[PDB]
Write a protein that binds this ligand. Structure first.
Ligand code: MG
Ligand code: MG
Lengths: 396, 396
């Protein structure tokens, strides 16, 4: 097994090329060291590294046979002895997802600039969706220490150019994610249950004020929730059923969970809302775990307080950890998706922390930020493509 | 968002191309529909589908700008309006793994012939290992109903050309495999414990006869095991410790399990050997589950019989199923790796049934057959590459 020899075929794709090339190579004394091939928009590139004897390699026989056979039918072929060339490419270090509606060329351009500026090469680019959102994957190779810089760079690009840009490690380990938890209110579920409840009271205004203030940061969650729930004092606890079946799942939420089931994920929710309303829905969606606060009921009437302990911001993290343990999933292989500053400790604690249509407070400490009203775009940050979802769904 | 326009750049890779192309496209009115890119052996192919107005598209402005910018620095670019072209490629239907030592060009050729004969196209080829075994992945698109035929075709190729050839579904679901069970004897572990025990008795000959006969098919496993274990009557049960720490893990077994842990697999063994010898080792390798037969000991002496129930061929399947349930993994998302006709019901029952250096009896009903004395090659049939293993291992 003397010298290495590199055959590279390019040109417009045609049937039988791969087979024609290897049938030819078999007439000489050839063993395969590596093979790479792809067709992009009817452009073939076929890259073969072979290990033949010094006899066969430095002999005009092999060269003229391959050159005759490729050129005879359309394509081009180069042939060069190396003995200095890598056999099998090292893996990408990271992967970057770009989601937009639309993704302007200008947006994509800004991404590549920052990538190139920071010494990163692009190993591959592919699409991972067309609808509801255009999704593009770049698998990249990042110099050590550029990692902190590159996210910084791309996060400016994100806000400027109006696309979602996420950077994830492209490792074996941190790719086998297997536990995900969703916030409920304005994540898995359209809107805020507590405003829907406060509306029954006639207090949607007082509450939606404090509500859009606590999940933005201005108010402590505990003292906010007590002042918010208080407004419900007097309501008949049948209000909980009314608002429960008044709820609308976020766009794509069913698709999101179904696909997560297909991939064998443990799924659960961690909320500061109310078990009574949530558990009804978590049965429907076959959830593995629920953590919520609880409304104190006295003679079929809410008293405007809750039954401790309070799932506060620290509570959400603690609940993710407890869920991780019972299911036997390391923390780094866990995912959290939430929208408010409520969700800061949870997202930080999780392996991959995703902010969904989230207040600036969360979108500034989250691993990844989505900004379209489609929860299924969570799947693209987890390595899934639309075409895959679409395929799997069609076999029922 | 009028007509679609397809830009395709090819040529020898150079820094800044991706960015140069999109910076240019931003000066016109362009939104990205799809992007595909790869560099194989310094050959760039960049494939962009854009969605610009009828104004921009049918205007010589865009064409001359892109054409000037690409050609100015080395590469070629075509540009054609389509409005009839697919946006985002459908996924591969299956994936084929070719493992050899070596993989001759002739071997690879035979694979591509059968592929082409049966109407299948190759979407991608990449390497997934160089050592210990050359590994090559072909992601293919298979016409419906060709599936049964294609495995048939490639299985002849396998035996003729001296490579391992496996065909797996390339679906979302049947790719998220998460539970694997190994046979112990001549799978996870070098050799046969019961011959190592029978040797202590002075009965290696009588036993290795019947042993290499039952895991080939000629003898019923129960009546074989009773006649085999019988030969141990009289031995002091301290023999079990002696043979336990006389065992050698199959080449790569530690790497196999470690990687499986990284990927968050439940791992276990299902044996017709002896809990007393096996459990010692299963603690070491942090196994989630053990199923084995058990040696009847009377006053520190083996009696040559076992304590029922007997893990027979049907037992192994039943044990996999029980393991699947306790861990909450559907059967189709389970993996079994074994070597004897002992392992037929288990491998059939499993989602993916892998025969490892296995008797013809198993290698004729197993989903996939390996034939090299390296158990880590199990990982390549599970979508892992050497470079990935090598990367993950190096971060400790
Ligand atoms: Mg929230
Ligand atoms: Mg066996």
């Amino acid at each position: 097994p003397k010298v290495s020899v590199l055959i590279t075929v390019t040109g417009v794709d045609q049937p039988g090329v791969t087979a024609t090339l290897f049938e030819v190579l078999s007439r000489h004394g050839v063993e395969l060291l590596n093979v790479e091939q792809v067709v992009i928009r009817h452009r073939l590139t076929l890259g073969v590294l072979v290990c033949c004897p010094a006899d066969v390699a430095d002999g005009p026989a092999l060269r003229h046979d391959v050159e005759a056979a490729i050129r005879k039918v359309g394509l081009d072929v180069s042939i060069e002895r190396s003995d200095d060339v890598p056999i099998i490419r090292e893996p990408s270090t990271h992967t970057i997802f770009v989601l937009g509606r639309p993704i302007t060329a200008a947006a994509f351009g800004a991404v590549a600039r920052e990538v190139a500026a920071l010494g990163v090469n692009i190993d591959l680019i592919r699409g991972v969706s067309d609808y509801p959102v255009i999704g593009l994957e770049l698998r990249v190779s990042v110099p050590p220490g550029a990692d902190g810089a590159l996210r910084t760079a791309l996060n400016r690009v994100s806000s400027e150019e109006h696309v979602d840009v996420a950077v994830e490690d492209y490792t074996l380990e941190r790719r086998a994610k297997r536990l995900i938890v969703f916030d409920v209110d304005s994540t898995l579920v359209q809107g805020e249950v507590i405003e829907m409840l406060a509306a029954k009271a006639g207090a949607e205004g007082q509450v939606a004020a404090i509500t859009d203030a606590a999940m933005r940061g201005e108010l402590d969650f505990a003292q906010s929730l007590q002042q918010r729930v208080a407004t419900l004092a007097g309501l008949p606890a049948t209000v909980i059923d009314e608002v429960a079946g008044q709820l609308e799942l976020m766009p794509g939420a069913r698709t999101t969970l179904r696909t997560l089931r297909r991939l064998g994920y443990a799924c659960g929710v961690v909320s500061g809302g109310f078990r009574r309303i949530i558990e009804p829905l978590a049965e429907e969606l076959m959830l593995d775990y629920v953590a919520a606060n609880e409304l104190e009921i006295v003679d079929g009437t809410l008293t405007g307080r809750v039954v401790g302990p309070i799932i506060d911001r620290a509570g959400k993290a603690t609940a993710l950890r407890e869920f991780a343990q019972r299911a036997g999933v390391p923390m780094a292989q866990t995912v959290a998706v939430g929208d408010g500053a409520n969700d800061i400790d949870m997202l930080a604690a999780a392996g991959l922390g995703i902010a969904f249509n989230a207040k600036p407070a969360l979108r500034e400490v989250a691993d990844a930020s989505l900004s379209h009203p489609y929860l299924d775009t969570v799947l693209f940050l987890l390595g899934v493509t639309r075409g895959e979802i679409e395929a799997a769904d069609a076999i029922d």
